[PDB]
Amino acid sequence: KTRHYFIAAVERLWDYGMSSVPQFKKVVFQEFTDGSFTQPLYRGELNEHLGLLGPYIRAEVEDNIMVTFRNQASRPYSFYSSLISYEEDQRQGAEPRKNFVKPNETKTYFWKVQHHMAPTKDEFDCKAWAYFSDVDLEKDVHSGLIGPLLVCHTNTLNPAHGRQVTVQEFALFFTIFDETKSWYFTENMERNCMEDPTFKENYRFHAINGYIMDTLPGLVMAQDQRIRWYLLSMGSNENIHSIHFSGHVFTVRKKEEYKMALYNLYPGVFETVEMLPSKAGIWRVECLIGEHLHAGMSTLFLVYSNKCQTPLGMASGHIRDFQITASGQYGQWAPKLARLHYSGSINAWSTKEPFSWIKVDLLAPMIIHGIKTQGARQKFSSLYISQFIIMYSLDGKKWQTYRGNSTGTLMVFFGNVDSSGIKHNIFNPPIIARYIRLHPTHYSIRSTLRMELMGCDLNSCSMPLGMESKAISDAQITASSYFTNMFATWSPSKARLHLQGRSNAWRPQVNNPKEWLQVDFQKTMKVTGVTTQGVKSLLTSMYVKEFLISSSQDGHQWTLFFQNGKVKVFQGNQDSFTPVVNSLDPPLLTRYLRIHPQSWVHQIALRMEVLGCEAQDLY
Amino acid sequence: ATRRYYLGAVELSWDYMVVYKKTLFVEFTDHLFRPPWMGLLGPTIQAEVYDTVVITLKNMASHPVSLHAVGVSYWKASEGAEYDDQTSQREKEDDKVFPGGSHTYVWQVLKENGPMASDPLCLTYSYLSHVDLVKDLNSGLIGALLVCREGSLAKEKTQTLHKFILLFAVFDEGKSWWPKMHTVNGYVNRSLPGLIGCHRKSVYWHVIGMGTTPEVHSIFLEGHTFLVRNHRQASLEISPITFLTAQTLLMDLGQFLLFCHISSHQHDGMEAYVKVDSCPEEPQAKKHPKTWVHYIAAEEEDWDYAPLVLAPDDRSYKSQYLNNGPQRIGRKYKKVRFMAYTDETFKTREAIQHESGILGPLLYGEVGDTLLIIFKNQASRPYNIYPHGITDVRPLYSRRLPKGVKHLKDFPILPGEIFKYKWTVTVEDGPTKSDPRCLTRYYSSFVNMERDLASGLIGPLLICYRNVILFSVFDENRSWYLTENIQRFLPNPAGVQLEDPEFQASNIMHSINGYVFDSLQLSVCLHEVAYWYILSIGAQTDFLSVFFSGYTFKHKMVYEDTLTLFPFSGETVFMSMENPGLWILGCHNSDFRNRGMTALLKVSSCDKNTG
């Protein structure tokens, strides 16, 4: 039984932006091994969401919270919560006797997490009390700190490993930030250039976990996975904040099971709720007070689908060569070489012994559930990468060492141990960056790799529908005209990517600059894009090089794609062998689809897949 | 189609039958060229779970007005939101509609969107427009949307029509387009019709709060108790934007009034009348109560919120309040309290506890118990004695009224006299199955409703199936005995600042139960479980009350709430509190200067005395 946490008050700088930059010195809470400073003060990945918030001090029913506390700012503070409880006393006093801690001073609070500090039979596997610094109930708190404590019943939160995990936890805390009433000259005086009306509203943030306007970060969601929310609210009388989870509803328990779609935080109240986001994507969660919204207090939870996963094409076409980058590789084993690419001498990236980084520009920010690593042989001597960490970013400005689950400073991943390794490493929780770097830690006499990261797109789309997967009927597929001869019958039905057999492709009876291949999706659908192809049949090779796309929601009316004003020419596949893919930047969405070849090499012929995601039937 | 609706957005003018023009929600069969009680509301749309709706809003407006849903499922089509959701065109299309643009919405009543079954049938949500909320909603961009248990509407033909949609709204008319508004469904001064209900049959309120600023309300119904959470509410506390499904029993007949009760709110509106008529008929020992007796009186005396350390002058935060200075009258003022008086007519029962300050006698009510307030106005100005909480209050011996006047609380105010009163308790007045027992109540002197109270007359009434903490604010300035106070403590005899900021709020003490910064200390021995009946009165703005001791303390209203309780002011609810805590306790006024100005108090951890 029992849990200790090593927690402390830091003075640090707060910014937002992304729109003169306002720089503020508030004081927050962080947790580290017990090495006072240089090491180790680290937390990250999933926990972004707390932001200003101190870390999750989670305990169980029964067991103890021990909480060491170190102040590191000019004016003494104190870790206090409701449950800073048993202090039996002996002619020594109780309440003011451990009241506060001077800078650098160091105190441990330790109590028994009684039943009266707990969730009831009336449900929710965890509660959500709060820790503040008393001494100044308002002053320091506004300026600096707030912490979310949560106790859960018995066999509830995971042994050794973290806390909970059955379900995802989030402590969004809603408040108005007045500043000025918080911290003084070092805060107040900075950016000097005058008491209430002039810019007073300017100091006031209306901020979730201290992120005004849409700044809040960590909302890895995950379709169909119970999510507990922690809504502890605070401040002065203005903040009755009526939080709303855009087109989601949740339940709460309190002697019964009530459903509701917005609940109001009376400063001090906190609370807990559970919901499961049935539909994935981006969405808002905001206080719905009109004034309070346009002053900030809105953020987006960015829920993904699990069944989304696909290669981003480091193997295939979609990824172009310019996309990659390296420490600079000794040997000509230049990057531009990754995954399955065995050609002649050269099939991978490969630097010398000094520490390296293969970074990847995805050309867009994107979610990524995992990477598949590779190594190659040369001259008998086995080349691979044994162990590595992933770094990622969005703008190339920020960078981040990825932790995911892994207890401590980060997760190191286990690479292959041979040439032709194929190690699917997995990123749940998953990365969001546009930029994935890769630093190796161990190798075998050299560093070297082929790789093909797999993720899905920021929205939970970009996936194949029928066609290849055969899930779309060759009753469903039609086309303008087809090449049918005794035996060979280049039916529209055969326009399915990577299909090998008799008559394995589509062909129009004889060629025309304007033909068409069509797919009766049946359901009204969205389309991310289209993977296109070509076929060789008996030593004669043939493929479609240029093409045009129709679509209709209308059985008999069609509307040509139009791009940047003009209708657009689609460039893909210089060959039969390979398939290559087109983005479809503004995604046309229809029930029925059509495709018209322009430049067709030798002879017209097509196999393909479509890309996409389901949207509502009957509309 | 499962069900479908057509909305408009028409710009119409409004008189609140002052004239104002507004762009509000409208409905038709399919384009073209209601029921009055609804008035302003964009039509109340409602769906059973599983069955799913579609609007096709036509923006027959100047404004580009969007359609957000607040409590169903969408696809980025249904919600009217533009925000960096990386969905692009056709999917932001209805995520904010253009002027003159007639565009279409889709939404679903998902099995999970539905009520819990511990919940009431039909959970009240609404809709609006998520395109500049303040520039929107004002001018009429709010309707009511309700989702209900599946075999739902089929019943309505069988079921009660007693489904009224109460829209409590602070339209800052002077947005989207001079001073504010306070309406109830879009009427101001007791305006508006409908609001009829059956006699012995109960009525249900589909309640919608409406803000666009931190604006708060507390809304009663003339002698009527509310049912919401299945705990009697008696108050319908209503936050900036809330959704509440409440019900009202509707005993008796005629015209009673719901209304926002606060300060300046009534001078702005928010009150409206609810008729009950009789209705068309259509058939297809060891136990029991005893009655309470109280010889009680309103006597007058000076009140000193003391004494602890007096910290003079430079303590320009502390002392300014309770120090006799050139223009100040600290600590002691002349008041009137209720006493149960010891030596007089109909003998007595009188001994005082320091622990409740001004607080009157505590009067205890068990359902079906009766009360016998043999009241006399012992001192000065004529004062009244009425209990907020109970209902059957008529002088004993007669249902007649002093011939002269309406509802005793109103007038017969007894200046040197004695009046005999009967407070019969019904179960109606009492706590439900769900609410904890001994719900907190108070009684005042309704010589008007407020003016005297401030003076110092107040006490605690428990209704039940006894530590009391009243927070209160004593204005002193509106107190009857101000002339008698100014001319008793201040240095210059009479002539002095008539009124001023400097002294005004310097003679408004923040009470702690009419006790000041530190007082009471209180006498609770460790491990003793208490019941803590607490209440705010005096001045208003929400309340934030907490216990902060050698165990901080936690308490249970059902599920245990922590360094928090929130009496709405002119309002009250009560608390169980296991005491395995410890000594010296910040006891919370908790909020703003409220904290700096008057909060404190303490708690103990003694033990070893038994009986």
Ligand SMILES: *[C@@H]1O[C@H](CO)[C@@H](O[C@@H]2O[C@H](CO)[C@@H](O[C@@H]3O[C@H](CO[C@H]4O[C@H](CO[C@H]5O[C@H](CO)[C@@H](O)[C@H](O)[C@@H]5O)[C@@H](O)[C@H](O)[C@@H]4O)[C@@H](O)[C@H](O[C@@H]4O[C@H](CO)[C@@H](O)[C@H](O)[C@@H]4O[C@H]4O[C@H](CO)[C@@H](O)[C@H](O)[C@@H]4O)[C@@H]3O)[C@H](O)[C@H]2NC(C)=O)[C@H](O)[C@H]1NC(C)=O
């Ligand atoms: C890093 O941290 C993250 C979280 O921060 C963790 O990743 C998470 O891992 C857990 C556990 O490994 C994952 O949960 C798993 O989910 C699968 C399948 O999902 C379930 O839910 C789906 C939706 O249905 C919902 O509604 C159902 C009621 O209608 C309800 O039952 C269900 O729970 C859902 O709420 C649906 O596909 C299924 O219903 C499915 O159940 C599940 O199969 C996993 O296993 C269960 O384990 C319990 C406890 O032993 C058993 O009682 C069940 O019967 C399941 O048995 C499974 O394991 C046994 C072997 O023990 C095996 O024989 C059997 O075949 C099952 O496989 C499990 O619950 C969660 O989704 C991950 N979350 C995230 C965000 O990644 C990890 O700790 C860590 N992970 C990594 C990869 O590094």
Ligand SMILES: *[C@@H]1O[C@H](CO)[C@@H](O[C@@H]2O[C@H](CO)[C@@H](O[C@@H]3O[C@H](CO[C@H]4O[C@H](CO)[C@@H](O)[C@H](O)[C@@H]4O)[C@@H](O)[C@H](O)[C@@H]3O)[C@H](O)[C@H]2NC(C)=O)[C@H](O)[C@H]1NC(C)=O
């Ligand atoms: C709804 O009912 C309200 C009252 O129940 C009505 O309010 C009152 O009526 C009008 C509109 O406000 C006012 O008419 C004039 O107002 C002045 C000044 O008002 C007060 O505030 C100023 C501010 O400095 C103060 O100086 C004054 O002393 C007042 O206290 C009055 O002095 C005039 O007599 C005059 O009546 C009333 O003032 C206002 N009430 C009060 C208390 O003044 C409202 O009109 C109704 N609205 C509708 C739509 O029906």
Ligand SMILES: *[C@@H]1O[C@H](CO)[C@@H](O[C@@H]2O[C@H](CO)[C@@H](O)[C@H](O)[C@H]2NC(C)=O)[C@H](O)[C@H]1NC(C)=O
């Ligand atoms: C606690 O905090 C202060 C910082 O204000 C401490 O000063 C530092 O002490 C550590 C010793 O480990 C050194 O690393 C630094 O050189 C010191 N910083 C300075 C002098 O600026 C100090 O130890 C404590 N403060 C007091 C007042 O005793």
Ligand SMILES: [Ca+2]
């Ligand atoms: Ca839309």
Ligand SMILES: [Ca+2]
């Ligand atoms: Ca949108």
Ligand SMILES: [Ca+2]
């Ligand atoms: Ca009065």
Ligand SMILES: [Cu+2]
């Ligand atoms: Cu708000």
Ligand SMILES: [Cu+2]
């Ligand atoms: Cu009001």
